[PDB]
Amino acid sequence: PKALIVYGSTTGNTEYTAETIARELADAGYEVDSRDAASVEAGGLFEGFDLVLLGCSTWADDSIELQDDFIPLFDSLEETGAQGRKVACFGCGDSSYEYFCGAVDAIEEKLKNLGAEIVQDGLRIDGDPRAARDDIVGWAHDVRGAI
Numbered sequence: 001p002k003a004l005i006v007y008g009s010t011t012g013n014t015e016y017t018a019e020t021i022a023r024e025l026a027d028a029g030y031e032v033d034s035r036d037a038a039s040v041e042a043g044g045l046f047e048g049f050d051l052v053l054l055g056c057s058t059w060a061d062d063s064i065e066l067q068d069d070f071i072p073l074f075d076s077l078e079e080t081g082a083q084g085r086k087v088a089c090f091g092c093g094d095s096s097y098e099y100f101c102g103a104v105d106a107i108e109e110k111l112k113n114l115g116a117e118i119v120q121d122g123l124r125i126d127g128d129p130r131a132a133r134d135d136i137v138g139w140a141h142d143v144r145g146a147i
């Protein structure tokens with residue numbers, strides 16, 4: 001199977017998380033394509049992928065709390081080929097904020113509205129992802145089991 005991982009990360013936490021998930025999928029036999037949201041074009045982005053994992057950090061704001069590099073993708077999610085696609089979301093945040101990992105909820109909800117198939121509840125990491133390595137690997141393990 002081929003998996004696409006797209007992440008938006010400012011300080012590197014969601015990027016570390018994406019790389020950890022990418023390793024788990026690869027060690028399980030998937031061919032994985034891991035890309036920074038700052039470098040992708042939304043049009044047909046998901047074409048040909050069996051599984052798509054989208055990740056992003058949350059930044060408190062009055063209008064949109066998604067990480068800046070992910071915004072353009074999020075705004076054009078309807079052109080990616082999400083209908084009937086198996087997808088799962090993940091993201092880093094901090095539970096001292098009201099909207100803890102709120103970007104994960106936002107992305108899941110829009111993918112659901114576009115007809116995607118959410119394979120597993122989103123991975124929400126509090127603090128340093130390096131300290132949650134077991135949680136990432138385990139979630140990655142469960143998403144492969146749902147595909």
Ligand SMILES: Cc1cc2nc3c(=O)[nH]c(=O)nc-3n(C[C@H](O)[C@H](O)[C@H](O)COP(=O)(O)O)c2cc1C
Binds near residue numbers: 065099
């Ligand atoms: C100014 C600021 C605002 C933040 N706002 C939120 C927030 O609204 N919700 C949340 O869960 N985390 C919030 N965080 C925590 C970041 O999402 C967290 O530091 C995260 O690990 C960053 O991930 P990244 O390195 O992949 O961009 C905020 C952090 C800062 C510095």
